[PDB]
């Protein structure tokens, strides 16, 4: 994962400071898990990845050239508009997994910062509104027949308002 | 459950069936045995007196005021036995009382094991078909003379014959398999 | 006090006057009804206990019940009052009730959205 | 426990003690079972068969 | 999409040409594979709808169904091998062919670009269905049921015929692709307010709405099991598929012209759900269960929110599979019992141990148990309906409580309690009966693992 | 197998019809009390006492055990309600 | 109700295990691919854009 | 084939189905490389972007 | 170390904005309960082997008991509420299967239908809360729902309170837990006694961060918890069935548990659940 | 759990109880000995006897069939028949 | 009464053919009508079908969009652009009325 698309804070751990003669029942167990559960598995896994690296293959990420958007597309020309409703229905999803990440990045930031979520985790929630106030302003009223012509109108009904209110 | 219901009830069976409902609903208020064995021989006294009333009218006026005394002096949660209707185990084991006409669709493999079992079962099924004629005829030859019919069925009355309609009182699912 | 049978919690057998009825007639019906049931009982009990039978005992008393309840209804329908007044309050009554329940809500919602009060926060779905 | 002990003991005194008015409201579960289980299932099924289904 | 179709047509030659003894296996085995070719349409790596050719297309909404339509023909032919095994060897080959034509026609209707191609194929499906119901129907009343099934659909159908020819003149082509990418915005006149009703009413009729659903209880009652499976699983959903593709046009009016139906459906959902509560005929109860769970769908294809639509797509595919499963097991009881009465036949688990497990899972699918697509579906329609008006939960809340009650009552008075004393002894279960069921539920378990495939066009 | 004459018909208008129906339903002619004629469909179906199967003698060998109903006895119109599961009209101590 | 399962639990397990052997051995020895940059004019073929080997053996051969 | 020819009837349908299917592709061949999104110059030794 | 863990094992659907995933939380409530529940379960299965000895279907009975435990633990450790729903409905259905173990007895069947009806009335509340959290703040995952602290959160928590009252036998629809005793005694111990009933108390502790904000619902359950405590206790005084008296005591103690949740003292309420 | 009954263990208990009823002499109680015509007891004492038996064997003899448990033996086969003891 | 047949009973096909599988009366057709139905039904549709359906790649692009977001979120955040700007069709392209 891209430490930058799915961030993750650096870790700060208090150091071991035992103050009891008794023996910790956790440290012993781990010493076992590490030998009877991890080593055995670790061995297999590696052997997996070397089997992979022999005939290493690659897969790319289709890059879609940008076609002309409905805003510029003849009326009635089903050809151009078809290529332009897809370009949008495509960005209706790319603009949706982005919102999936903010749904996620936050969820983690409230598990990683419990009892402080009220505060420490406000870098995100400020963003979850900076992103939700936008998704609400370009994709929400629309029916289940969402189309670029309708986002073009949902916007342009309001561009009057950012022009009637302003005036 | 076995014997058939009489059409109308007599005076007696109504009185003598209160002596049961009453004494048994007195062991729900009086739990301890002693208190009971006391408070109950005092009950019989109540029934013991007014035993020889010959004045029917009166008798049916003591009975009708007994069963109202009782209805208002009954226990909401009496002691009803574990396996009797209304009980706690009533019809519990009925999920295991399959009706025995179902062993007739068993695969020849299943019935292959359990061999002597089906050797005796085929005998009994021969008994059943061997008498249906003598039975139904009995049931009929002994029919009522165009009179009141009860749910009672006749006994055998001849050697070799089997009590009429005996296939489901006998050969009935075991109570607690 | 005195038990008071209601349509539910009915009068028990005991405490019931008619039980305490021994008029000749009653004991003539009470013995004339067992006959019908004994007669029907001895028409079930030697046809179910019949060897050599595979056909389905029918219980025609149940077939007279279903026919009476789903195929003998409309042939016995006569439109009266207490039937059409009550046959319109049931079909259109609530159907008109909820319309003014849903219209008023949907209209309240719409107004508020139009005027700018409804928060619709963190609602990115619908 | 103290109060319950005494009452229980008093029971075994050859002195018959029947229910007080409340004992019934106590033993048959406050009567919520006797009343709300016979009315609701009765007036919810009567309306389907008699009114919504047949009428 | 002519492999899902041409190979299908060829089934007809095989049912006729094949040996009388081997006719059943050739047909059932081959259409199982016909379903396997159908699965290829599911390969949609991209968003673009797969326009196979001018007349034939498959988009997310049709694809989940075409596969179900192909899947049930095998099952239908397996559920009707018993009854219809008493026929003359030419009545069978007619029934098998009739079933074959239904999915040929239904596959095309669900996979049709031109809306009037939908109409011609849409209303043709009545011919095969009416024959299946009337010709082989056991009860004296199927002549009547057939009449009800033909007239309610037909009187609705001619208005749609006039409406679609009308839009062709107004827009100039009934091609669903273009009609979508073209500006057809009705103008809220009094007339348009009629157009909208003309287009939706024919679809609303075969999707039983509370007002016109009397045809479905009567039809499934006397219909043979294969006809009842087809009506519940694919035939009723033809109405839903139509409402999704036709409301692309008539975009503005449904905002305010839907209230009448929405309220008819939600109140209808409660009353249809409730009468299931005391109906003596099991096939009767499943049919009203079908009306109520389809009344939810017309109330999501009208609210028109993304979630509704795929709630609808989820529920339609799911309820289709569940209903058949219920209609199929109802038949197995009917054939041994010989009566549709629910009160008789009590205690079957005691004598048919597994069929009861199938009965239990079918009922849990019927009510909304959560790790099931059936629940996901209702949960979503419920959400949107709540968005339409928070009060909707009350009515969609009385239905959930009632739906739990009748679903379990079918299990409690049919598959539990003491065994019936001695009905004609109930012969053990055939392996066909059990598979016909397994074939219904194993797909219900597999689809619930990955709900994305049946989510609809919206998502 | 069931004749139309052995199946429910219209409200018994004349007294001979009220005694003919009582045969069909295996009842006593003086106990057949047709449901009130208000045209709601009941027809000739007997108006049997509205008592639930709960208080039918729980010991007697009822042919149909669980419905506590014998074979032939007129079934009650609402037996889907007063059955041993759904509703309980049964006398209560209070 | 037992002959059925030995047949259903069998003919699923008949073709089921050779699959499971197939998914496991492919996923083990051959493996999913690792993502890369389109190399200045590779114009990758339809099969090149998918990860799993099995999910590309099909795409290349049939779609 | 001892009257098992019947079997081929259905399979054969698939083959003709796929054949007729290709025919349609051949017909709907305009825009082969004119689709704005996918308009590319033919790579060496390739006369058809999609066949 | 007093540290928690949210584990997202498998993704089920993206469903656009609302992604759905299978998540197990490991907060203090979840692991403390997981240990207490299995200890009780380990006790009961051994009891079950002795109690149902001579039952012809012992294996099926043990099978359903563990399926109950699997649904109960899923209900315990559920991050998104869709999984909480899977557990909430799931224990309801297996309770139906296990209260009426002896299907033949109509009394057991009547109680089983009772239990499903009361649970489904409760389900309407959870669906309402789920739908409100599927709209307004948007995700069924607890980690985000808790960001709805400064919102209204009354429409939703009233829904969960309704769900708890049905599942936890509060004064409204209190009768099915007494009725549930128609089940086998081991079934009565592990599900009627501990795991199934505490589910309603557990749900509100999970959603308490939201509960502390709304004063109105806190006193609402304090009030009904209080009424059930005495109402059930007074009924228990005269009952003459040993299993029934214990069951009423199960309801009262939970009435006390409801009272502490009503007085906004979530941690101690959980402590009583374990000791109870 | 407990051991099943026998047609001679369901007979020794029935005679046992009755031998403890004061009115019924314990030396003239014989299984074929009728309660009301041979031993002397009244009608009310039949109800009381049966009830003892219902409490010795833990089940309820239906009244319609309990109204006839006269012989001190009918009680011994009826109890056994109701409990399926084929000896 | 008119001439018509007496009710035909339904045979206990399980009496002969005790291995009846429910498909046909004669046994061999029975066996060969389940050996081909469990096989074509379960063995190569529920198995091969689920295998193929499971391996459909990035169905409806939802495997592609969780990366394109990641680069867009990678690119938008690092270059300081708003992660989801608030107008999609650029305002400049739109020609509003007057
Ligand atoms: C000491 C011993 C140590 C052993 C260590 C492991 C050794 C080993 O075998 O290496 C792992 C190695 C795989 O690991 P890998 O290659 O490192 O990584 C796997 C790839 O990333 C991916 O490879 P893949 O995806 O091609 O293969 C795995 C895949 C294979 O795909 C299939 O199996 C397709 C179906 C085939 C059916 C055939 C019949 O399995 C799945 O797709 C599982 C999908 C989910 C199944 C379970 C259902 C979950 C949902 C349940 C419904 C309810 C949801 C509720 C949600 C609620 C939320 C609120 O080999 C395998 O084990 C393959 C297993 C395949 C199983 C197929 C059966
Ligand atoms: C507007 C809604 C109806 C408003 C009026 C409702 C009460 C009507 C009272 C009519 C009284 C006379 C009558 O009997 O009904 C008229 C007709 C039958 O008339 P007839 O058979 O001649 O009876 C003569 C009685 N003196 O029978 C009728 O025409 C009844 C007319 C009203 C029927 C309403 C039925 C609505 C059903 C909706 C179902 C939705 C689901
Ligand atoms: C058993 C347990 C079942 C639990 C089911 C719970 C279902 C809850 C449904 C709530 C739906 C509405 C939520 C918001 C209600 C609210 O308080 O605010 C909005 C409401 C809008 O009301 P409106 O008609 O628009 O006019 C009022 C304008 N201020 O403004 C108002 O406050 C007006 C008053 C609203 C009162 C709503 C009461 C609903 C009660 C539902 C359960 C009880 C009824 C069950 C069904 C009875 C009929 C069969
Ligand atoms: C029952 C099922 C549902 C039936 C619905 C029937 C609705 C009425 C018939 C179809 C209505 C319709 O198609 O609406 C639009 C149509 C044309 O209206 P307009 O746009 O004014 O056309 C003139 C263009 N210069 O306007 C019309 O066609 C109006 C026709 C009304 C009368 C048609 C005959 C009805 C017979 C019954
Ligand atoms: C003032 C008091 C406090 C406020 C009101 C609190 C209660 C509100 C309503 C809650 C539901 C009430 C009915 C619950 C179901 C029920 O009670 O079933 C019991 C019935 C008989 O069983 P029972 O009396 O428990 O004892 C058996 C003895 N042999 O067992 C049955 O078989 C009943 C019939 C079952 C099948 C039909 C059930 C009715 C279905 C539709 C109605 C559902 C309940 C009403 C709608 C939801 C209300 C919340
Ligand atoms: C299709 C429209 C409706 C048609 C209805 C009738 C269709 C009948 C004919 C076709 C029946 C089979 C095809 C339909 C069901 C397909 C089920 C399926 O594809 O399962 C998907 C599952 C992987 O799930 P996936 O969504 O990729 O993971 C989510 C990650 N967020 O893949 C799996 O791993 C499933 C595993 C299930 C258990 C198999 C046994 C264990 C071994 C594998 C684990
Ligand atoms: C606790 C609830 C208290 C309720 C007590 C209830 O009132 C009972 C009471 O004490 S008050 C009635 C006493 N008992 C009679 O009223 C019977 C009178 N009936 C006759 O006397 C007959 O004529 C007959 C000769 C048949 C009796 O003879 P017998 O029954 O065969 O033995
Ligand atoms: Zn034991």
PDB file of N, CA and C in Angstrom, chain A residues 46-97:
ATOM      1  N   UNK A  46       8.224 -17.811   2.001  1.00  0.00           N
ATOM      2  CA  UNK A  46       9.326 -17.420   1.159  1.00  0.00           C
ATOM      3  C   UNK A  46       9.283 -18.292  -0.069  1.00  0.00           C
ATOM      4  N   UNK A  47       9.358 -19.590   0.130  1.00  0.00           N
ATOM      5  CA  UNK A  47       9.326 -20.556  -0.962  1.00  0.00           C
ATOM      6  C   UNK A  47       8.215 -20.254  -1.958  1.00  0.00           C
ATOM      7  N   UNK A  48       7.113 -19.657  -1.504  1.00  0.00           N
ATOM      8  CA  UNK A  48       6.110 -19.153  -2.433  1.00  0.00           C
ATOM      9  C   UNK A  48       6.734 -18.104  -3.342  1.00  0.00           C
ATOM     10  N   UNK A  49       7.247 -17.029  -2.742  1.00  0.00           N
ATOM     11  CA  UNK A  49       7.673 -15.861  -3.498  1.00  0.00           C
ATOM     12  C   UNK A  49       8.839 -16.140  -4.436  1.00  0.00           C
ATOM     13  N   UNK A  50       9.613 -17.200  -4.206  1.00  0.00           N
ATOM     14  CA  UNK A  50      10.736 -17.455  -5.100  1.00  0.00           C
ATOM     15  C   UNK A  50      10.101 -18.188  -6.278  1.00  0.00           C
ATOM     16  N   UNK A  51       9.130 -19.073  -6.025  1.00  0.00           N
ATOM     17  CA  UNK A  51       8.371 -19.640  -7.149  1.00  0.00           C
ATOM     18  C   UNK A  51       7.697 -18.605  -8.134  1.00  0.00           C
ATOM     19  N   UNK A  52       7.123 -17.579  -7.511  1.00  0.00           N
ATOM     20  CA  UNK A  52       6.757 -16.377  -8.246  1.00  0.00           C
ATOM     21  C   UNK A  52       7.788 -15.583  -9.040  1.00  0.00           C
ATOM     22  N   UNK A  53       8.968 -15.375  -8.453  1.00  0.00           N
ATOM     23  CA  UNK A  53       9.968 -14.517  -9.070  1.00  0.00           C
ATOM     24  C   UNK A  53      10.656 -15.175 -10.258  1.00  0.00           C
ATOM     25  N   UNK A  54      10.595 -16.505 -10.364  1.00  0.00           N
ATOM     26  CA  UNK A  54      11.167 -17.185 -11.521  1.00  0.00           C
ATOM     27  C   UNK A  54      10.512 -16.697 -12.809  1.00  0.00           C
ATOM     28  N   UNK A  55       9.228 -16.982 -12.974  1.00  0.00           N
ATOM     29  CA  UNK A  55       8.449 -16.473 -14.101  1.00  0.00           C
ATOM     30  C   UNK A  55       7.655 -15.231 -13.690  1.00  0.00           C
ATOM     31  N   UNK A  56       8.381 -14.188 -13.311  1.00  0.00           N
ATOM     32  CA  UNK A  56       7.717 -12.967 -12.908  1.00  0.00           C
ATOM     33  C   UNK A  56       7.069 -12.308 -14.120  1.00  0.00           C
ATOM     34  N   UNK A  57       5.779 -12.015 -13.973  1.00  0.00           N
ATOM     35  CA  UNK A  57       4.990 -11.365 -15.009  1.00  0.00           C
ATOM     36  C   UNK A  57       4.505 -10.032 -14.467  1.00  0.00           C
ATOM     37  N   UNK A  58       3.920  -9.229 -15.349  1.00  0.00           N
ATOM     38  CA  UNK A  58       3.534  -7.865 -15.021  1.00  0.00           C
ATOM     39  C   UNK A  58       2.150  -7.573 -15.570  1.00  0.00           C
ATOM     40  N   UNK A  59       1.464  -6.636 -14.917  1.00  0.00           N
ATOM     41  CA  UNK A  59       0.136  -6.198 -15.322  1.00  0.00           C
ATOM     42  C   UNK A  59       0.067  -4.691 -15.129  1.00  0.00           C
ATOM     43  N   UNK A  60      -0.421  -3.985 -16.147  1.00  0.00           N
ATOM     44  CA  UNK A  60      -0.446  -2.530 -16.153  1.00  0.00           C
ATOM     45  C   UNK A  60      -1.833  -2.012 -15.777  1.00  0.00           C
ATOM     46  N   UNK A  61      -2.006  -0.702 -15.802  1.00  0.00           N
ATOM     47  CA  UNK A  61      -3.257  -0.086 -15.389  1.00  0.00           C
ATOM     48  C   UNK A  61      -3.772   0.741 -16.522  1.00  0.00           C
ATOM     49  N   UNK A  62      -4.784   0.227 -17.209  1.00  0.00           N
ATOM     50  CA  UNK A  62      -5.317   0.915 -18.367  1.00  0.00           C
ATOM     51  C   UNK A  62      -5.463   2.390 -18.116  1.00  0.00           C
ATOM     52  N   UNK A  63      -4.872   3.191 -18.986  1.00  0.00           N
ATOM     53  CA  UNK A  63      -4.985   4.607 -18.830  1.00  0.00           C
ATOM     54  C   UNK A  63      -5.930   5.058 -19.894  1.00  0.00           C
ATOM     55  N   UNK A  64      -6.983   5.743 -19.497  1.00  0.00           N
ATOM     56  CA  UNK A  64      -7.978   6.158 -20.452  1.00  0.00           C
ATOM     57  C   UNK A  64      -7.731   7.570 -20.908  1.00  0.00           C
ATOM     58  N   UNK A  65      -7.524   7.744 -22.198  1.00  0.00           N
ATOM     59  CA  UNK A  65      -7.332   9.058 -22.747  1.00  0.00           C
ATOM     60  C   UNK A  65      -8.589   9.807 -22.470  1.00  0.00           C
ATOM     61  N   UNK A  66      -8.501  11.120 -22.356  1.00  0.00           N
ATOM     62  CA  UNK A  66      -9.672  11.906 -22.038  1.00  0.00           C
ATOM     63  C   UNK A  66     -10.398  12.319 -23.296  1.00  0.00           C
ATOM     64  N   UNK A  67     -11.666  11.955 -23.402  1.00  0.00           N
ATOM     65  CA  UNK A  67     -12.472  12.368 -24.536  1.00  0.00           C
ATOM     66  C   UNK A  67     -13.224  13.657 -24.212  1.00  0.00           C
ATOM     67  N   UNK A  68     -13.916  14.246 -25.198  1.00  0.00           N
ATOM     68  CA  UNK A  68     -14.632  15.510 -24.974  1.00  0.00           C
ATOM     69  C   UNK A  68     -15.835  15.337 -24.072  1.00  0.00           C
ATOM     70  N   UNK A  69     -16.056  16.239 -23.120  1.00  0.00           N
ATOM     71  CA  UNK A  69     -17.134  16.059 -22.149  1.00  0.00           C
ATOM     72  C   UNK A  69     -18.449  16.618 -22.616  1.00  0.00           C
ATOM     73  N   UNK A  70     -19.548  16.121 -22.065  1.00  0.00           N
ATOM     74  CA  UNK A  70     -20.855  16.526 -22.554  1.00  0.00           C
ATOM     75  C   UNK A  70     -20.918  18.021 -22.733  1.00  0.00           C
ATOM     76  N   UNK A  71     -20.282  18.767 -21.856  1.00  0.00           N
ATOM     77  CA  UNK A  71     -20.381  20.205 -21.940  1.00  0.00           C
ATOM     78  C   UNK A  71     -20.084  20.584 -23.351  1.00  0.00           C
ATOM     79  N   UNK A  72     -19.130  19.937 -23.955  1.00  0.00           N
ATOM     80  CA  UNK A  72     -18.893  20.220 -25.338  1.00  0.00           C
ATOM     81  C   UNK A  72     -19.246  18.952 -26.017  1.00  0.00           C
ATOM     82  N   UNK A  73     -20.420  18.851 -26.623  1.00  0.00           N
ATOM     83  CA  UNK A  73     -20.812  17.663 -27.381  1.00  0.00           C
ATOM     84  C   UNK A  73     -22.086  17.992 -28.095  1.00  0.00           C
ATOM     85  N   UNK A  74     -22.116  17.783 -29.403  1.00  0.00           N
ATOM     86  CA  UNK A  74     -23.288  18.211 -30.147  1.00  0.00           C
ATOM     87  C   UNK A  74     -24.540  17.601 -29.522  1.00  0.00           C
ATOM     88  N   UNK A  75     -25.667  18.278 -29.718  1.00  0.00           N
ATOM     89  CA  UNK A  75     -26.953  17.778 -29.250  1.00  0.00           C
ATOM     90  C   UNK A  75     -27.511  16.811 -30.278  1.00  0.00           C
ATOM     91  N   UNK A  76     -27.976  15.655 -29.807  1.00  0.00           N
ATOM     92  CA  UNK A  76     -28.490  14.621 -30.677  1.00  0.00           C
ATOM     93  C   UNK A  76     -27.444  13.707 -31.266  1.00  0.00           C
ATOM     94  N   UNK A  77     -26.177  14.119 -31.281  1.00  0.00           N
ATOM     95  CA  UNK A  77     -25.108  13.271 -31.796  1.00  0.00           C
ATOM     96  C   UNK A  77     -24.875  12.159 -30.787  1.00  0.00           C
ATOM     97  N   UNK A  78     -25.539  11.024 -31.003  1.00  0.00           N
ATOM     98  CA  UNK A  78     -25.456   9.917 -30.061  1.00  0.00           C
ATOM     99  C   UNK A  78     -24.045   9.365 -29.950  1.00  0.00           C
ATOM    100  N   UNK A  79     -23.225   9.525 -30.987  1.00  0.00           N
ATOM    101  CA  UNK A  79     -21.865   9.004 -30.947  1.00  0.00           C
ATOM    102  C   UNK A  79     -21.033   9.727 -29.899  1.00  0.00           C
ATOM    103  N   UNK A  80     -20.859  11.034 -30.072  1.00  0.00           N
ATOM    104  CA  UNK A  80     -20.053  11.829 -29.155  1.00  0.00           C
ATOM    105  C   UNK A  80     -20.564  11.738 -27.726  1.00  0.00           C
ATOM    106  N   UNK A  81     -21.873  11.900 -27.541  1.00  0.00           N
ATOM    107  CA  UNK A  81     -22.439  11.899 -26.195  1.00  0.00           C
ATOM    108  C   UNK A  81     -22.268  10.543 -25.517  1.00  0.00           C
ATOM    109  N   UNK A  82     -22.380   9.452 -26.274  1.00  0.00           N
ATOM    110  CA  UNK A  82     -22.134   8.123 -25.725  1.00  0.00           C
ATOM    111  C   UNK A  82     -20.720   8.015 -25.185  1.00  0.00           C
ATOM    112  N   UNK A  83     -19.739   8.485 -25.946  1.00  0.00           N
ATOM    113  CA  UNK A  83     -18.356   8.460 -25.471  1.00  0.00           C
ATOM    114  C   UNK A  83     -18.141   9.420 -24.314  1.00  0.00           C
ATOM    115  N   UNK A  84     -19.062  10.355 -24.126  1.00  0.00           N
ATOM    116  CA  UNK A  84     -18.922  11.360 -23.086  1.00  0.00           C
ATOM    117  C   UNK A  84     -19.761  11.079 -21.851  1.00  0.00           C
ATOM    118  N   UNK A  85     -20.790  10.239 -21.963  1.00  0.00           N
ATOM    119  CA  UNK A  85     -21.503   9.786 -20.773  1.00  0.00           C
ATOM    120  C   UNK A  85     -20.711   8.675 -20.108  1.00  0.00           C
ATOM    121  N   UNK A  86     -19.931   7.948 -20.893  1.00  0.00           N
ATOM    122  CA  UNK A  86     -19.055   6.960 -20.291  1.00  0.00           C
ATOM    123  C   UNK A  86     -17.905   7.625 -19.544  1.00  0.00           C
ATOM    124  N   UNK A  87     -17.258   8.576 -20.206  1.00  0.00           N
ATOM    125  CA  UNK A  87     -16.210   9.313 -19.522  1.00  0.00           C
ATOM    126  C   UNK A  87     -16.639   9.873 -18.196  1.00  0.00           C
ATOM    127  N   UNK A  88     -17.927  10.103 -18.024  1.00  0.00           N
ATOM    128  CA  UNK A  88     -18.433  10.614 -16.755  1.00  0.00           C
ATOM    129  C   UNK A  88     -18.796   9.464 -15.831  1.00  0.00           C
ATOM    130  N   UNK A  89     -19.584   8.500 -16.327  1.00  0.00           N
ATOM    131  CA  UNK A  89     -19.920   7.322 -15.534  1.00  0.00           C
ATOM    132  C   UNK A  89     -18.677   6.619 -14.991  1.00  0.00           C
ATOM    133  N   UNK A  90     -17.607   6.625 -15.774  1.00  0.00           N
ATOM    134  CA  UNK A  90     -16.278   6.315 -15.273  1.00  0.00           C
ATOM    135  C   UNK A  90     -15.750   7.186 -14.139  1.00  0.00           C
ATOM    136  N   UNK A  91     -15.877   8.510 -14.262  1.00  0.00           N
ATOM    137  CA  UNK A  91     -15.436   9.389 -13.187  1.00  0.00           C
ATOM    138  C   UNK A  91     -16.453   9.448 -12.061  1.00  0.00           C
ATOM    139  N   UNK A  92     -17.679   8.976 -12.301  1.00  0.00           N
ATOM    140  CA  UNK A  92     -18.628   8.797 -11.216  1.00  0.00           C
ATOM    141  C   UNK A  92     -18.158   7.734 -10.241  1.00  0.00           C
ATOM    142  N   UNK A  93     -17.235   6.868 -10.666  1.00  0.00           N
ATOM    143  CA  UNK A  93     -16.693   5.807  -9.834  1.00  0.00           C
ATOM    144  C   UNK A  93     -15.339   6.191  -9.249  1.00  0.00           C
ATOM    145  N   UNK A  94     -14.464   6.750 -10.083  1.00  0.00           N
ATOM    146  CA  UNK A  94     -13.169   7.235  -9.608  1.00  0.00           C
ATOM    147  C   UNK A  94     -13.404   8.300  -8.547  1.00  0.00           C
ATOM    148  N   UNK A  95     -14.454   9.101  -8.709  1.00  0.00           N
ATOM    149  CA  UNK A  95     -14.829  10.065  -7.682  1.00  0.00           C
ATOM    150  C   UNK A  95     -15.606   9.428  -6.536  1.00  0.00           C
ATOM    151  N   UNK A  96     -15.744   8.103  -6.537  1.00  0.00           N
ATOM    152  CA  UNK A  96     -16.495   7.371  -5.531  1.00  0.00           C
ATOM    153  C   UNK A  96     -15.601   6.503  -4.666  1.00  0.00           C
ATOM    154  N   UNK A  97     -14.517   5.983  -5.239  1.00  0.00           N
ATOM    155  CA  UNK A  97     -13.536   5.246  -4.454  1.00  0.00           C
ATOM    156  C   UNK A  97     -12.662   6.199  -3.652  1.00  0.00           C
TER     157      UNK A  97
END
